[model samples]
Target: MPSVGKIVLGTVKGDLHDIGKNLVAMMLESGGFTVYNLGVDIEPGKFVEAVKKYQPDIVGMSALLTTTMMNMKSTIDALIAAGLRDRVKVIVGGAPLSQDFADEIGADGYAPDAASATELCRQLL
Candidate 1:
């Protein structure tokens, strides 16, 4: 049998919304990936630790507010700082997120919904 990969999902720090992140976690799990839901108000280092521990193929970040949304960039910065930038694939999402922002932070992909996130995760893996 082929090996099943893992993925880490969560909202960036200062963002307290999690409905969307939870849905994405479920979708990715249904798609045959082991998903780790870090929930809301997630810190950047936690993402790095999860990636290091689980060695997930993908890391999904969600943000629901513009100001809090900037936390995603810091999360990405920490990921790069932890040497996970090129080592793992990154996907950014949520109401306030944008493709341009994802690109600016060097994320590998961007999606607006759980279904899209799942599909994008599948593609990246």
Candidate 2:
């Protein structure tokens, strides 16, 4: 694996489930991505902060619970609010997220699992 791109990743607010997010991070790292995993229950504001601080090429969000799924959208909204939405591509995953939901929330892409997530990031770069 060679360095292809950088990624800032996290699980959105109110969602503490991390197994999937961790796996996605590992996969992306294996895919030759420089990844910053921001851990679980991350707020939209923090996502915005990380984006600015890390200057990653991609922003990835994860949520396992259906209830917390909308937090992904909130994070996207926060990015737009911070005027960083166009600066990076956003991808989302986890059990409750689907391609339709990703599109609904205006994400740049969606992956159902870690491998696909890594592939998506590679493709985006």
Candidate 3:
């Protein structure tokens, strides 16, 4: 089957809560996206490596803590430094995250409709 797209997912550093991120992985994959999930506590550089390696359309990150969400900020800079800033979309989420929170961090999106992976597939991709 034709792939809908590719996505890289992870739970950021200092945060080990991955159950939510894992489901996000499943959701994107069910939509025919080749999801490359980095599991839990991923470093800022790891995301850049995945972006360089996978060449995916999107990068989705999760952080359970307000403190940890800041790591997502570094991850973006890491990618930008590597000249990959414009290569992919960045989506972030967690219980504590908000539209304004992500905007300040330079994130391109939030997975607000995580319940509808199928619809997410059709609508997002």
Candidate 4:
């Protein structure tokens, strides 16, 4: 299932929205990816820990507020500081995100919705 790959999905720290993140996780799992849904308000350190523990191919982050979106970058930066950046791909979503925001955060891409998120992971894999 290497081609199917694995994903660690969560909302960035300070964000409490989970409906979309959960939907995306369900979509990914139904599409055959091994998805770890880490619920809402996840810290960058925990994301790093999950990456190390799960050895996922991709990390998907969600944030419902524009204010909280910066935590996505913090998570990415944490991944870099922990020397795990190169080991996994990163994607982001939530109402406040766009392709530009995704690029701004050094993410591999942005998914506008759950279905697109599943497809994005498929393509990334």
Local distance difference test, candidate 4: 0.92
Residue range 30-56, candidate 4, lDDT tens digits: 877999888888999999999999999
RMSD of each: 1.6, 1.0, 1.9, 1.5
Lowest lDDT 10-residue stretch of candidate 1: 1-10
Of 3 and 4, the candidate ranking higher by lDDT: 4
Q: Residue by residue across 1-125, what tens digits does model 1's lDDT show?
A: 24367888888888888888888887777767888888888898999988998888888888888888778879889988887788889899988788898898889999978888878887888
Q: Considering lDDT, which of the candidate structures 1 and 4 is the better prediction for this target?
A: 4
Q: Sorted on TM-score, highest at the top, how do the candidates line up?
A: 2, 4, 1, 3
Candidate 2 structure quality by residue, lDDT tens digits, 13-96: 998899989988888888689999999999999999999999999999989899999998899999999999999999999887
In model 4, the Cα lDDT at residue 96 comes to 85
Count of clashing residue pairs in every prediction:
0, 0, 0, 0
Give the alpha carbon lDDT tens digit for every residue of 23-115 in model 3.
877776765778888888899899999998999888888888988989999999898899997888788888888779889999877756466
Clashing pairs in 4: none
Candidate 2: clashing pairs of residues = none
Which residue window of length 10 is worst by lDDT in model 2?
Answer: 23-32
Cα-based lDDT for every prediction: 0.84, 0.92, 0.82, 0.92
- Residue 110's lDDT within candidate 1 is 95
Name the candidate, 1 or 3, with the larger TM-score value. 1
